[PDB]
């Protein structure tokens, strides 16, 4: 029944349009702890292609075939909702690697590593209101992720002095946004917020600049990898982008709790995969293990791996262990706050000379 190993199942997106998010998540697993408390970690990684059906199947294989103590994933919101559904039914701790709406139905067994949308929205809107932005347009996905961002722009953003003059949506698989851009450019808001991720985030970037949009463009943390710059090229110049601090540990003070783990991950990842290969996404899987390094020893005091008692002790340890330092933030979860993050979890980036720079 009980085991020596601690069993962790991970479903991420390493094929399909979101592969650029999952590949680094999987690769970061080379750099995480092999053991916690003397107990070897048995880590089982699967691709879900970003599909909720595959992520549901993967999560179930972990909780039932592997008897996992913890499950992690996925890379994008729709499959992450699916994993949460499974985790909460099976009563297994779930560490999400994409923001998701953490409803009362999902909250008991799920926490999230990515910064919550309102923290990222605030940093972007604050900048807007320092840069003479009065009117704003939105272009984002026609699904839960695009909704969370739009709703935040409407609730938080408007309350900061923004007037929404245009709202357009597109689906993840689309390779053109020409019609939506036509309306947006026509409305000529002072700024446009793009609610998308990966290669799709670069699409409105290029397409708006080539249509002659001159306003400020703002990107979510779903865009925070070099892939965006790769894909957007010269059109990325001057973008403002919400990011976790892992994108610039060098720019942090030594007093920042996030600095050490950011330097650790980035040194390791960039030694194998090359300079400036750091990402938002690699950091979420890395940080999930930093959380495990705090909560697993607590659980090990009172429960044996491979048992429900251990899963329950992990659940309780997630909310008893405070100020968990990781590359993307300092986490303090509660029964009700399943993200656990504050201002230490974000910085604002721009692109100059084809590289990300921290906006001071
Ligand atoms: O595309 C989606 O659904 C996402 O959830 C993307 C995403 C993933 C991780 C982040 O830290 C921020 C955004
Ligand atoms: Cl810690």
């Amino acid at each position: 029944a009980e085991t020596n190993e601690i069993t962790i199942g991970i479903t991420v997106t390493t094929t399909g349009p979101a592969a650029a998010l999952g590949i680094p998540e999987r690769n970061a697993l080379e750099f995480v702890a092999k053991e916690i408390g003397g107990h070897p970690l048995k880590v089982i990684v699967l691709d879900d292609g970003g599909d909720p059906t595959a992520a549901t199947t993967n999560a179930r294989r972990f909780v039932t075939e592997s008897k996992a103590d913890v499950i992690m994933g996925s890379s994008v919101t729709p499959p992450t909702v699916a994993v949460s559904n499974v985790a909460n039914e099976a009563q297994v701790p779930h560490i999400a690697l994409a923001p998701l709406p953490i409803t009362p139905e999902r909250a008991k067994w799920s926490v999230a590593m990515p910064q919550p949308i309102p923290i990222m929205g605030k940093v972007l809107y604050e900048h807007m209101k320092k840069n003479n932005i009065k009117t704003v347009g939105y272009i984002g996905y026609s699904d839960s992720y695009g909704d969370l961002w739009f709703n935040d722009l409407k609730k938080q953003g408007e309350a900061m002095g923004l007037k929404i003059v245009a709202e357009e949506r597109f689906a993840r698989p689309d390779t053109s946004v020409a019609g939506q851009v036509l309306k947006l450019v026509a409305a000529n808001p002072d700024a446009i917020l793009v609610g998308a991720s990966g290669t799709a985030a670069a699409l409105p970037q290029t397409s708006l600049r080539e249509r002659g949009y001159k306003g400020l463009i703002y990107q979510t943390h779903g865009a925070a990898s070099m892939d965006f710059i790769r894909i957007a090229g010269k059109s990325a110049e001057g973008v403002l982008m919400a990011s976790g601090p892992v994108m610039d540990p060098e720019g942090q003070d030594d007093s920042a709790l996030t600095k050490k783990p950011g330097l650790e991950l980035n040194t390791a990842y960039e030694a194998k995969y090359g300079p400036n290969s750091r990402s938002q996404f690699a950091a979420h899987s890395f940080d999930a293990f930093k959380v495990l390094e705090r909560v697993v020893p607590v659980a090990l005091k009172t429960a044996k791996p491979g048992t429900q008692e251990f899963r329950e002790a992990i659940r309780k340890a997630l909310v008893s262990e405070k100020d968990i330092a990781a590359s993307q933030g300092v986490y303090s979860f509660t029964e009700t706050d399943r993200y656990g993050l504050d201002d230490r979890s974000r910085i604002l980036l721009t692109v100059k000379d084809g590289k990300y720079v921290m906006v001071k």
Side-chain angles (χ1 to χ4, degrees), residues 243-278:
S243 180
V246 73
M247 290 295 282
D248 187 16
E250 297 87 351
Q252 299 170 30
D253 294 320
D254 280 347
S255 59
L257 283 167
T258 55
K259 187 170 180 179
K260 173 176 66 168
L263 289 171
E264 291 172 355
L265 167 60
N266 293 348
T267 299
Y269 199 97
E270 299 184 324
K272 185 164 176 167
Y273 301 107
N276 274 119
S277 59
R278 64 190 62 186

PDB file of all heavy atoms in Angstrom, residues 243-278:
ATOM      1  N   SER A 243       5.235  39.526 -16.670  1.00  0.00           N
ATOM      2  CA  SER A 243       6.099  38.357 -16.581  1.00  0.00           C
ATOM      3  C   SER A 243       6.345  38.029 -15.147  1.00  0.00           C
ATOM      4  O   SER A 243       6.367  38.897 -14.305  1.00  0.00           O
ATOM      5  CB  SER A 243       7.438  38.697 -17.211  1.00  0.00           C
ATOM      6  OG  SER A 243       8.326  37.659 -17.174  1.00  0.00           O
ATOM      7  N   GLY A 244       6.563  36.759 -14.880  1.00  0.00           N
ATOM      8  CA  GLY A 244       7.192  36.373 -13.647  1.00  0.00           C
ATOM      9  C   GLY A 244       8.623  36.888 -13.601  1.00  0.00           C
ATOM     10  O   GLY A 244       9.240  37.148 -14.636  1.00  0.00           O
ATOM     11  N   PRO A 245       9.173  37.010 -12.394  1.00  0.00           N
ATOM     12  CA  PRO A 245      10.517  37.555 -12.171  1.00  0.00           C
ATOM     13  C   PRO A 245      11.635  36.665 -12.666  1.00  0.00           C
ATOM     14  O   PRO A 245      12.793  37.090 -12.753  1.00  0.00           O
ATOM     15  CB  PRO A 245      10.564  37.787 -10.666  1.00  0.00           C
ATOM     16  CG  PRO A 245       9.521  36.892 -10.093  1.00  0.00           C
ATOM     17  CD  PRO A 245       8.436  36.819 -11.124  1.00  0.00           C
ATOM     18  N   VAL A 246      11.319  35.407 -12.961  1.00  0.00           N
ATOM     19  CA  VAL A 246      12.329  34.471 -13.478  1.00  0.00           C
ATOM     20  C   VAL A 246      12.926  34.957 -14.774  1.00  0.00           C
ATOM     21  O   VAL A 246      14.001  34.518 -15.167  1.00  0.00           O
ATOM     22  CB  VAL A 246      11.741  33.028 -13.722  1.00  0.00           C
ATOM     23  CG1 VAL A 246      10.817  32.971 -14.962  1.00  0.00           C
ATOM     24  CG2 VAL A 246      12.879  31.993 -13.758  1.00  0.00           C
ATOM     25  N   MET A 247      12.238  35.845 -15.457  1.00  0.00           N
ATOM     26  CA  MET A 247      12.780  36.322 -16.705  1.00  0.00           C
ATOM     27  C   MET A 247      13.972  37.237 -16.483  1.00  0.00           C
ATOM     28  O   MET A 247      14.779  37.423 -17.412  1.00  0.00           O
ATOM     29  CB  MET A 247      11.721  37.010 -17.538  1.00  0.00           C
ATOM     30  CG  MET A 247      10.688  36.024 -18.073  1.00  0.00           C
ATOM     31  SD  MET A 247      11.389  34.700 -19.345  1.00  0.00           S
ATOM     32  CE  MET A 247      11.449  35.918 -20.890  1.00  0.00           C
ATOM     33  N   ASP A 248      14.134  37.789 -15.280  1.00  0.00           N
ATOM     34  CA  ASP A 248      15.324  38.626 -14.990  1.00  0.00           C
ATOM     35  C   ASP A 248      15.795  38.544 -13.547  1.00  0.00           C
ATOM     36  O   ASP A 248      15.697  39.521 -12.824  1.00  0.00           O
ATOM     37  CB  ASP A 248      15.009  40.080 -15.383  1.00  0.00           C
ATOM     38  CG  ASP A 248      16.205  41.012 -15.299  1.00  0.00           C
ATOM     39  OD1 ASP A 248      17.344  40.554 -15.241  1.00  0.00           O
ATOM     40  OD2 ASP A 248      15.974  42.246 -15.282  1.00  0.00           O
ATOM     41  N   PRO A 249      16.383  37.399 -13.144  1.00  0.00           N
ATOM     42  CA  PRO A 249      16.911  37.340 -11.790  1.00  0.00           C
ATOM     43  C   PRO A 249      18.113  38.287 -11.588  1.00  0.00           C
ATOM     44  O   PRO A 249      18.340  38.812 -10.480  1.00  0.00           O
ATOM     45  CB  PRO A 249      17.331  35.874 -11.633  1.00  0.00           C
ATOM     46  CG  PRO A 249      16.479  35.163 -12.626  1.00  0.00           C
ATOM     47  CD  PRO A 249      16.389  36.083 -13.793  1.00  0.00           C
ATOM     48  N   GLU A 250      18.872  38.485 -12.640  1.00  0.00           N
ATOM     49  CA  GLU A 250      20.018  39.388 -12.608  1.00  0.00           C
ATOM     50  C   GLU A 250      19.622  40.809 -12.166  1.00  0.00           C
ATOM     51  O   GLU A 250      20.402  41.503 -11.495  1.00  0.00           O
ATOM     52  CB  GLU A 250      20.696  39.448 -13.994  1.00  0.00           C
ATOM     53  CG  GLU A 250      21.287  38.128 -14.492  1.00  0.00           C
ATOM     54  CD  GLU A 250      20.324  37.228 -15.243  1.00  0.00           C
ATOM     55  OE1 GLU A 250      19.098  37.463 -15.288  1.00  0.00           O
ATOM     56  OE2 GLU A 250      20.808  36.231 -15.773  1.00  0.00           O
ATOM     57  N   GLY A 251      18.426  41.242 -12.559  1.00  0.00           N
ATOM     58  CA  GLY A 251      17.933  42.587 -12.277  1.00  0.00           C
ATOM     59  C   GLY A 251      17.345  42.718 -10.870  1.00  0.00           C
ATOM     60  O   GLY A 251      17.034  43.819 -10.431  1.00  0.00           O
ATOM     61  N   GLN A 252      17.169  41.585 -10.173  1.00  0.00           N
ATOM     62  CA  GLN A 252      16.612  41.599  -8.830  1.00  0.00           C
ATOM     63  C   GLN A 252      17.704  41.948  -7.821  1.00  0.00           C
ATOM     64  O   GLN A 252      18.894  41.678  -8.031  1.00  0.00           O
ATOM     65  CB  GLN A 252      15.967  40.244  -8.481  1.00  0.00           C
ATOM     66  CG  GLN A 252      14.804  39.854  -9.394  1.00  0.00           C
ATOM     67  CD  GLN A 252      14.359  38.418  -9.186  1.00  0.00           C
ATOM     68  OE1 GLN A 252      14.475  37.890  -8.081  1.00  0.00           O
ATOM     69  NE2 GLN A 252      13.928  37.748 -10.258  1.00  0.00           N
ATOM     70  N   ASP A 253      17.288  42.508  -6.685  1.00  0.00           N
ATOM     71  CA  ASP A 253      18.205  42.693  -5.554  1.00  0.00           C
ATOM     72  C   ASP A 253      18.469  41.334  -4.908  1.00  0.00           C
ATOM     73  O   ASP A 253      17.633  40.440  -5.016  1.00  0.00           O
ATOM     74  CB  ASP A 253      17.588  43.643  -4.548  1.00  0.00           C
ATOM     75  CG  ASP A 253      17.423  45.050  -5.097  1.00  0.00           C
ATOM     76  OD1 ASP A 253      18.331  45.523  -5.813  1.00  0.00           O
ATOM     77  OD2 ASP A 253      16.383  45.681  -4.824  1.00  0.00           O
ATOM     78  N   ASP A 254      19.627  41.175  -4.272  1.00  0.00           N
ATOM     79  CA  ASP A 254      19.938  39.921  -3.562  1.00  0.00           C
ATOM     80  C   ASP A 254      18.923  39.659  -2.465  1.00  0.00           C
ATOM     81  O   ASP A 254      18.713  38.515  -2.042  1.00  0.00           O
ATOM     82  CB  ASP A 254      21.343  39.958  -2.923  1.00  0.00           C
ATOM     83  CG  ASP A 254      22.441  39.680  -3.914  1.00  0.00           C
ATOM     84  OD1 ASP A 254      22.143  39.206  -5.043  1.00  0.00           O
ATOM     85  OD2 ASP A 254      23.611  39.938  -3.567  1.00  0.00           O
ATOM     86  N   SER A 255      18.269  40.705  -2.005  1.00  0.00           N
ATOM     87  CA  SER A 255      17.306  40.520  -0.944  1.00  0.00           C
ATOM     88  C   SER A 255      16.025  39.844  -1.453  1.00  0.00           C
ATOM     89  O   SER A 255      15.201  39.441  -0.645  1.00  0.00           O
ATOM     90  CB  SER A 255      16.960  41.872  -0.336  1.00  0.00           C
ATOM     91  OG  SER A 255      16.433  42.721  -1.337  1.00  0.00           O
ATOM     92  N   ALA A 256      15.815  39.777  -2.763  1.00  0.00           N
ATOM     93  CA  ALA A 256      14.600  39.124  -3.295  1.00  0.00           C
ATOM     94  C   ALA A 256      14.689  37.614  -3.143  1.00  0.00           C
ATOM     95  O   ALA A 256      15.633  36.986  -3.628  1.00  0.00           O
ATOM     96  CB  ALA A 256      14.395  39.480  -4.758  1.00  0.00           C
ATOM     97  N   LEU A 257      13.684  37.052  -2.461  1.00  0.00           N
ATOM     98  CA  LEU A 257      13.586  35.605  -2.210  1.00  0.00           C
ATOM     99  C   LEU A 257      13.507  34.821  -3.523  1.00  0.00           C
ATOM    100  O   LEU A 257      13.873  33.663  -3.581  1.00  0.00           O
ATOM    101  CB  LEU A 257      12.367  35.280  -1.344  1.00  0.00           C
ATOM    102  CG  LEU A 257      12.552  35.592   0.145  1.00  0.00           C
ATOM    103  CD1 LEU A 257      11.226  35.548   0.874  1.00  0.00           C
ATOM    104  CD2 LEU A 257      13.546  34.603   0.749  1.00  0.00           C
ATOM    105  N   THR A 258      13.003  35.461  -4.569  1.00  0.00           N
ATOM    106  CA  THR A 258      12.882  34.819  -5.884  1.00  0.00           C
ATOM    107  C   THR A 258      14.234  34.692  -6.626  1.00  0.00           C
ATOM    108  O   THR A 258      14.365  33.897  -7.566  1.00  0.00           O
ATOM    109  CB  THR A 258      11.883  35.606  -6.780  1.00  0.00           C
ATOM    110  OG1 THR A 258      12.276  36.970  -6.867  1.00  0.00           O
ATOM    111  CG2 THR A 258      10.446  35.500  -6.251  1.00  0.00           C
ATOM    112  N   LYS A 259      15.243  35.471  -6.211  1.00  0.00           N
ATOM    113  CA  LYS A 259      16.475  35.580  -7.006  1.00  0.00           C
ATOM    114  C   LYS A 259      17.260  34.268  -7.085  1.00  0.00           C
ATOM    115  O   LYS A 259      17.608  33.807  -8.209  1.00  0.00           O
ATOM    116  CB  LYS A 259      17.380  36.745  -6.531  1.00  0.00           C
ATOM    117  CG  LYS A 259      18.580  37.001  -7.412  1.00  0.00           C
ATOM    118  CD  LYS A 259      19.280  38.293  -7.037  1.00  0.00           C
ATOM    119  CE  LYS A 259      20.490  38.566  -7.924  1.00  0.00           C
ATOM    120  NZ  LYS A 259      21.164  39.848  -7.561  1.00  0.00           N
ATOM    121  N   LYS A 260      17.537  33.680  -5.941  1.00  0.00           N
ATOM    122  CA  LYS A 260      18.329  32.467  -5.875  1.00  0.00           C
ATOM    123  C   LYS A 260      17.670  31.348  -6.727  1.00  0.00           C
ATOM    124  O   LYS A 260      18.323  30.783  -7.583  1.00  0.00           O
ATOM    125  CB  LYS A 260      18.608  32.056  -4.391  1.00  0.00           C
ATOM    126  CG  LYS A 260      19.291  30.718  -4.204  1.00  0.00           C
ATOM    127  CD  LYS A 260      19.654  30.349  -2.762  1.00  0.00           C
ATOM    128  CE  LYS A 260      18.411  30.151  -1.882  1.00  0.00           C
ATOM    129  NZ  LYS A 260      18.658  29.523  -0.537  1.00  0.00           N
ATOM    130  N   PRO A 261      16.368  31.033  -6.498  1.00  0.00           N
ATOM    131  CA  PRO A 261      15.833  29.932  -7.287  1.00  0.00           C
ATOM    132  C   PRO A 261      15.752  30.253  -8.816  1.00  0.00           C
ATOM    133  O   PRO A 261      15.861  29.353  -9.671  1.00  0.00           O
ATOM    134  CB  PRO A 261      14.413  29.718  -6.708  1.00  0.00           C
ATOM    135  CG  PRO A 261      14.133  30.938  -5.904  1.00  0.00           C
ATOM    136  CD  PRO A 261      15.455  31.412  -5.396  1.00  0.00           C
ATOM    137  N   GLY A 262      15.556  31.510  -9.161  1.00  0.00           N
ATOM    138  CA  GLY A 262      15.599  31.932 -10.561  1.00  0.00           C
ATOM    139  C   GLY A 262      16.963  31.755 -11.188  1.00  0.00           C
ATOM    140  O   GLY A 262      17.086  31.208 -12.286  1.00  0.00           O
ATOM    141  N   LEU A 263      18.006  32.156 -10.471  1.00  0.00           N
ATOM    142  CA  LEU A 263      19.343  31.922 -10.956  1.00  0.00           C
ATOM    143  C   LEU A 263      19.633  30.441 -11.091  1.00  0.00           C
ATOM    144  O   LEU A 263      20.292  30.013 -12.059  1.00  0.00           O
ATOM    145  CB  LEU A 263      20.402  32.558 -10.031  1.00  0.00           C
ATOM    146  CG  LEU A 263      20.492  34.077 -10.031  1.00  0.00           C
ATOM    147  CD1 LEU A 263      21.443  34.519  -8.883  1.00  0.00           C
ATOM    148  CD2 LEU A 263      21.008  34.603 -11.360  1.00  0.00           C
ATOM    149  N   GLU A 264      19.159  29.631 -10.140  1.00  0.00           N
ATOM    150  CA  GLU A 264      19.409  28.194 -10.208  1.00  0.00           C
ATOM    151  C   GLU A 264      18.793  27.615 -11.467  1.00  0.00           C
ATOM    152  O   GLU A 264      19.459  26.918 -12.216  1.00  0.00           O
ATOM    153  CB  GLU A 264      18.865  27.426  -8.977  1.00  0.00           C
ATOM    154  CG  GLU A 264      19.609  27.700  -7.681  1.00  0.00           C
ATOM    155  CD  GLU A 264      18.954  27.106  -6.455  1.00  0.00           C
ATOM    156  OE1 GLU A 264      17.842  26.545  -6.565  1.00  0.00           O
ATOM    157  OE2 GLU A 264      19.541  27.229  -5.365  1.00  0.00           O
ATOM    158  N   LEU A 265      17.503  27.871 -11.682  1.00  0.00           N
ATOM    159  CA  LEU A 265      16.833  27.295 -12.844  1.00  0.00           C
ATOM    160  C   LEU A 265      17.450  27.799 -14.147  1.00  0.00           C
ATOM    161  O   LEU A 265      17.763  27.023 -15.034  1.00  0.00           O
ATOM    162  CB  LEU A 265      15.366  27.630 -12.881  1.00  0.00           C
ATOM    163  CG  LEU A 265      14.608  27.355 -14.188  1.00  0.00           C
ATOM    164  CD1 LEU A 265      14.652  25.880 -14.587  1.00  0.00           C
ATOM    165  CD2 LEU A 265      13.179  27.848 -13.982  1.00  0.00           C
ATOM    166  N   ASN A 266      17.590  29.107 -14.266  1.00  0.00           N
ATOM    167  CA  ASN A 266      18.102  29.648 -15.500  1.00  0.00           C
ATOM    168  C   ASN A 266      19.554  29.194 -15.825  1.00  0.00           C
ATOM    169  O   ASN A 266      19.863  28.868 -16.969  1.00  0.00           O
ATOM    170  CB  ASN A 266      17.990  31.181 -15.527  1.00  0.00           C
ATOM    171  CG  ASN A 266      16.571  31.657 -15.577  1.00  0.00           C
ATOM    172  OD1 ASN A 266      15.656  30.874 -15.812  1.00  0.00           O
ATOM    173  ND2 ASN A 266      16.378  32.964 -15.428  1.00  0.00           N
ATOM    174  N   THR A 267      20.434  29.142 -14.837  1.00  0.00           N
ATOM    175  CA  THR A 267      21.791  28.647 -15.078  1.00  0.00           C
ATOM    176  C   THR A 267      21.715  27.223 -15.645  1.00  0.00           C
ATOM    177  O   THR A 267      22.362  26.898 -16.627  1.00  0.00           O
ATOM    178  CB  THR A 267      22.643  28.733 -13.799  1.00  0.00           C
ATOM    179  OG1 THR A 267      22.714  30.098 -13.401  1.00  0.00           O
ATOM    180  CG2 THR A 267      23.999  28.191 -14.050  1.00  0.00           C
ATOM    181  N   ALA A 268      20.899  26.381 -15.035  1.00  0.00           N
ATOM    182  CA  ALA A 268      20.795  24.980 -15.444  1.00  0.00           C
ATOM    183  C   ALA A 268      20.176  24.873 -16.863  1.00  0.00           C
ATOM    184  O   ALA A 268      20.699  24.190 -17.738  1.00  0.00           O
ATOM    185  CB  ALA A 268      19.978  24.195 -14.440  1.00  0.00           C
ATOM    186  N   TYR A 269      19.043  25.540 -17.058  1.00  0.00           N
ATOM    187  CA  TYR A 269      18.302  25.431 -18.303  1.00  0.00           C
ATOM    188  C   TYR A 269      19.136  26.016 -19.454  1.00  0.00           C
ATOM    189  O   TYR A 269      19.212  25.427 -20.529  1.00  0.00           O
ATOM    190  CB  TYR A 269      16.938  26.158 -18.192  1.00  0.00           C
ATOM    191  CG  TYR A 269      15.947  25.696 -19.244  1.00  0.00           C
ATOM    192  CD1 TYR A 269      14.991  24.744 -18.970  1.00  0.00           C
ATOM    193  CD2 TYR A 269      16.048  26.152 -20.577  1.00  0.00           C
ATOM    194  CE1 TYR A 269      14.150  24.293 -19.940  1.00  0.00           C
ATOM    195  CE2 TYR A 269      15.185  25.696 -21.566  1.00  0.00           C
ATOM    196  CZ  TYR A 269      14.278  24.741 -21.263  1.00  0.00           C
ATOM    197  OH  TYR A 269      13.427  24.238 -22.244  1.00  0.00           O
ATOM    198  N   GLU A 270      19.733  27.178 -19.215  1.00  0.00           N
ATOM    199  CA  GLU A 270      20.483  27.852 -20.275  1.00  0.00           C
ATOM    200  C   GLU A 270      21.836  27.180 -20.533  1.00  0.00           C
ATOM    201  O   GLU A 270      22.324  27.259 -21.637  1.00  0.00           O
ATOM    202  CB  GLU A 270      20.595  29.349 -19.960  1.00  0.00           C
ATOM    203  CG  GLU A 270      19.184  29.964 -19.891  1.00  0.00           C
ATOM    204  CD  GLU A 270      19.141  31.455 -19.674  1.00  0.00           C
ATOM    205  OE1 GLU A 270      20.002  31.978 -18.923  1.00  0.00           O
ATOM    206  OE2 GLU A 270      18.228  32.114 -20.251  1.00  0.00           O
ATOM    207  N   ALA A 271      22.419  26.493 -19.556  1.00  0.00           N
ATOM    208  CA  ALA A 271      23.615  25.686 -19.831  1.00  0.00           C
ATOM    209  C   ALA A 271      23.316  24.543 -20.822  1.00  0.00           C
ATOM    210  O   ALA A 271      24.096  24.301 -21.747  1.00  0.00           O
ATOM    211  CB  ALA A 271      24.245  25.162 -18.551  1.00  0.00           C
ATOM    212  N   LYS A 272      22.144  23.908 -20.704  1.00  0.00           N
ATOM    213  CA  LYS A 272      21.816  22.821 -21.628  1.00  0.00           C
ATOM    214  C   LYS A 272      21.218  23.344 -22.948  1.00  0.00           C
ATOM    215  O   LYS A 272      21.459  22.794 -24.011  1.00  0.00           O
ATOM    216  CB  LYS A 272      20.891  21.810 -20.976  1.00  0.00           C
ATOM    217  CG  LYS A 272      20.630  20.603 -21.877  1.00  0.00           C
ATOM    218  CD  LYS A 272      20.045  19.436 -21.120  1.00  0.00           C
ATOM    219  CE  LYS A 272      19.715  18.286 -22.060  1.00  0.00           C
ATOM    220  NZ  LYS A 272      19.449  17.030 -21.270  1.00  0.00           N
ATOM    221  N   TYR A 273      20.377  24.359 -22.882  1.00  0.00           N
ATOM    222  CA  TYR A 273      19.580  24.750 -24.049  1.00  0.00           C
ATOM    223  C   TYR A 273      20.004  26.095 -24.664  1.00  0.00           C
ATOM    224  O   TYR A 273      19.491  26.474 -25.697  1.00  0.00           O
ATOM    225  CB  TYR A 273      18.079  24.680 -23.738  1.00  0.00           C
ATOM    226  CG  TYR A 273      17.634  23.297 -23.308  1.00  0.00           C
ATOM    227  CD1 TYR A 273      17.309  23.015 -21.986  1.00  0.00           C
ATOM    228  CD2 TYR A 273      17.592  22.262 -24.218  1.00  0.00           C
ATOM    229  CE1 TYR A 273      16.926  21.710 -21.609  1.00  0.00           C
ATOM    230  CE2 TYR A 273      17.226  21.001 -23.872  1.00  0.00           C
ATOM    231  CZ  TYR A 273      16.857  20.725 -22.554  1.00  0.00           C
ATOM    232  OH  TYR A 273      16.527  19.453 -22.215  1.00  0.00           O
ATOM    233  N   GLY A 274      20.954  26.782 -24.017  1.00  0.00           N
ATOM    234  CA  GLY A 274      21.588  27.950 -24.589  1.00  0.00           C
ATOM    235  C   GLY A 274      21.178  29.258 -23.943  1.00  0.00           C
ATOM    236  O   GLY A 274      20.157  29.343 -23.253  1.00  0.00           O
ATOM    237  N   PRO A 275      21.960  30.296 -24.188  1.00  0.00           N
ATOM    238  CA  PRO A 275      21.627  31.565 -23.645  1.00  0.00           C
ATOM    239  C   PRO A 275      20.251  32.086 -23.998  1.00  0.00           C
ATOM    240  O   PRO A 275      19.732  31.880 -25.104  1.00  0.00           O
ATOM    241  CB  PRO A 275      22.729  32.472 -24.166  1.00  0.00           C
ATOM    242  CG  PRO A 275      23.900  31.548 -24.353  1.00  0.00           C
ATOM    243  CD  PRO A 275      23.267  30.292 -24.867  1.00  0.00           C
ATOM    244  N   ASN A 276      19.653  32.758 -23.019  1.00  0.00           N
ATOM    245  CA  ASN A 276      18.304  33.316 -23.157  1.00  0.00           C
ATOM    246  C   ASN A 276      17.195  32.340 -23.544  1.00  0.00           C
ATOM    247  O   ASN A 276      16.158  32.743 -24.060  1.00  0.00           O
ATOM    248  CB  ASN A 276      18.293  34.478 -24.109  1.00  0.00           C
ATOM    249  CG  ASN A 276      18.622  35.725 -23.406  1.00  0.00           C
ATOM    250  OD1 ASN A 276      19.591  36.353 -23.736  1.00  0.00           O
ATOM    251  ND2 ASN A 276      17.843  36.056 -22.348  1.00  0.00           N
ATOM    252  N   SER A 277      17.393  31.087 -23.196  1.00  0.00           N
ATOM    253  CA  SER A 277      16.344  30.098 -23.350  1.00  0.00           C
ATOM    254  C   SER A 277      15.430  30.003 -22.129  1.00  0.00           C
ATOM    255  O   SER A 277      14.511  29.202 -22.145  1.00  0.00           O
ATOM    256  CB  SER A 277      16.886  28.698 -23.709  1.00  0.00           C
ATOM    257  OG  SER A 277      17.781  28.211 -22.735  1.00  0.00           O
ATOM    258  N   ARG A 278      15.658  30.833 -21.105  1.00  0.00           N
ATOM    259  CA  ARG A 278      14.756  30.895 -19.941  1.00  0.00           C
ATOM    260  C   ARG A 278      13.330  31.173 -20.411  1.00  0.00           C
ATOM    261  O   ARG A 278      13.112  31.820 -21.429  1.00  0.00           O
ATOM    262  CB  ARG A 278      15.212  31.999 -19.026  1.00  0.00           C
ATOM    263  CG  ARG A 278      15.131  33.416 -19.636  1.00  0.00           C
ATOM    264  CD  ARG A 278      15.806  34.484 -18.808  1.00  0.00           C
ATOM    265  NE  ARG A 278      17.225  34.234 -18.659  1.00  0.00           N
ATOM    266  CZ  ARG A 278      18.033  34.966 -17.883  1.00  0.00           C
ATOM    267  NH1 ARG A 278      17.540  36.008 -17.225  1.00  0.00           N
ATOM    268  NH2 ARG A 278      19.331  34.650 -17.780  1.00  0.00           N
TER     269      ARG A 278
END
